[PDB]
């Protein structure tokens, strides 16, 4: 069972749930940020994602005429201790919403149990190595005003605040010399840029299909589903199955090329436009990568960075993670049936579509959908607007039927239009 911890931003450092941790991309460079353990292996650093970005990238465009309504900027987001607390409490509420039903509970469990392999492709077949950015992150164990002393701890996911564009949530993996452990069967510490308030809007759905122009319905997204979408990428990245650069050329609304990774993650009727050949090659690549992991497990003898780590305990943890089988002599191998079940679970089981169906959340029909302007949700921490159990679609307020709590024309008090330009663009899109 998954426990979702509680803390406030101003709560003191305890070297358990609240620490100073050095993120993966900042490894070796003694910069530590206040990190909060929301569940085992999952941390939240309520700061803006600045990796590979300059401070000027965070600024808004020079004026209204050159603004892009599809891309929202605000350099003042997360600038105070109180804004960093609002972020943490919103994340705890969203995580509590994810575990409120069986599907999301298992998603969090699969993420937690999906520990990165103790190594990558550079590591010898006979060794486990924890001294890399994709397996461990440094924790500051010394008090302020003392010479910095560290300890490497295991982690699976680190969620940060947004990068320059607030409404563009993204899950990132670690690359070493254009090779990602998260795409090679190993798995690796995943990172995310997340923003709960600025959500996506759509009008693609099963309705509107032939319906009158005035009777066209436009809805806003639930921040929990948006988070669950990104957590599926984390899952693929933790099990070493993230599909690398593979664009797919095409109900549906857009004909534009999209990544294979994004299609499987969205799910529903999306994996159907993928040629049976491409679909089979993605499956075969995962098998070949898992075959590499099993060969390593059969050859691993020592842990180079941690000669204390018990080889048998970790081999067993990896046997459970990848659902490998063992013979009478201890030798591991792949069982096609258990592999098929795990594969179908990671790629087709945990999708945005059936998470949306199970949670009564409204989402778009296809990923091949038009980008509508984002909207800002004023307060997610108010139960009169948003709940852990039901979302925006609250039963008492008659928002549970026809997903009316997500309908922009109906639940006008749950959100606010970012600008007059955003509304003007939305009105043209709703009535083409
Ligand atoms: Zn995505």
From Swiss-Prot:
Entry binding sites for Zn(2+): 229, 233, 262
Protein name, UniProt field: Botulinum neurotoxin B light chain
Domain comment as written in the entry: Has protease activity.
List of catalytic residues: 230
Protein localization: Secreted; Host cytoplasm, Host cytosol
Function: Has proteolytic activity. After translocation into the eukaryotic host cytosol, inhibits neurotransmitter release by acting as a zinc endopeptidase that cleaves the '76-Gln-|-Phe-77' bond of synaptobrevin-2/VAMP2, blocking neurotransmitter release. In vitro the LC only has protease activity after reduction.
Organism: Clostridium botulinum
Gene label: botB
Section covered of the full-length record: 2 to 438 of 1291
């Amino acid at each position: 069972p998954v426990t979702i911890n509680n803390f406030n931003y101003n709560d003191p450092i305890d070297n358990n749930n609240i620490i100073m941790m050095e993120p993966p991309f900042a490894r070796g460079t003694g910069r530590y940020y206040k990190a909060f353990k929301i569940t085992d292996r999952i941390w939240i650093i309520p700061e803006r994602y600045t990796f590979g970005y300059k401070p000027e990238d965070f600024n808004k465009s020079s004026g209204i005429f050159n603004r892009d309504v599809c891309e929202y900027y605000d350099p003042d987001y997360l600038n105070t201790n109180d804004k960093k607390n609002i972020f943490l409490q919103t994340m705890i509420k969203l995580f509590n919403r994810i575990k409120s039903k069986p599907l999301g509970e298992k998603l969090l469990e699969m993420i937690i149990n999906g520990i990165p392999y103790l190594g990558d492709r550079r590591v010898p077949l006979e060794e486990f190595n924890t001294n890399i950015a994709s397996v461990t992150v440094n924790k500051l164990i010394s008090n302020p005003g003392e010479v910095e002393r560290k300890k490497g701890i295991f982690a699976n996911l680190i969620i940060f605040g947004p990068g320059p564009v607030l409404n563009e949530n993204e899950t990132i993996d670690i690359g070493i010399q254009n090779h990602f452990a998260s795409r090679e069967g190993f798995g690796g510490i995943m990172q995310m840029k997340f923003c709960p308030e600025y959500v996506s809007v759509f009008n693609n759905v099963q309705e509107n299909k032939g319906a009158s122009i005035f009777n066209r319905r436009g809805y806003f997204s639930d921040p929990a589903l948006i988070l669950m979408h990104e957590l599926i990428h984390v899952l693929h990245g933790l099990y070493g199955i993230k599909v690398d650069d593979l664009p797919i050329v095409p109900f549906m609304q857009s004909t534009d090329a999209i990544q294979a990774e994004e299609l499987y993650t969205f799910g529903g009727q999306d994996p159907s436009i993928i040629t049976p050949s491409t679909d089979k090659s993605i499956y075969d690549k995962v098998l070949q990568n898992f075959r590499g992991i099993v060969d390593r497990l059969n050859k691993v003898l020592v842990c180079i960075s941690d000669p204390n780590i018990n080889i048998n305990i970790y081999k067993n943890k990896f046997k459970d993670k990848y659902k490998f089988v063992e013979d009478s002599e201890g030798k591991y191998s792949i069982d096609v049936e258990s592999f098929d079940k795990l594969y179908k679970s990671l790629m087709f089981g945990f999708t945005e579509t059936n998470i949306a169906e199970n949670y009564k959340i409204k989402t778009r029909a296809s990923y091949f959908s038009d980008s509508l302007p984002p909207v800002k949700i004023k307060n997610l921490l108010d139960n009169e607007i948003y709940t852990i159990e039901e979302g925006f679609n609250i039963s008492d307020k008659d928002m549970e039927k026809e997903y009316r709590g997500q309908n922009k024309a109906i639940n006008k008090q749950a959100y606010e239009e970012i600008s007059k330009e955003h509304l003007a663009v939305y009105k043209i899109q709703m009535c083409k």
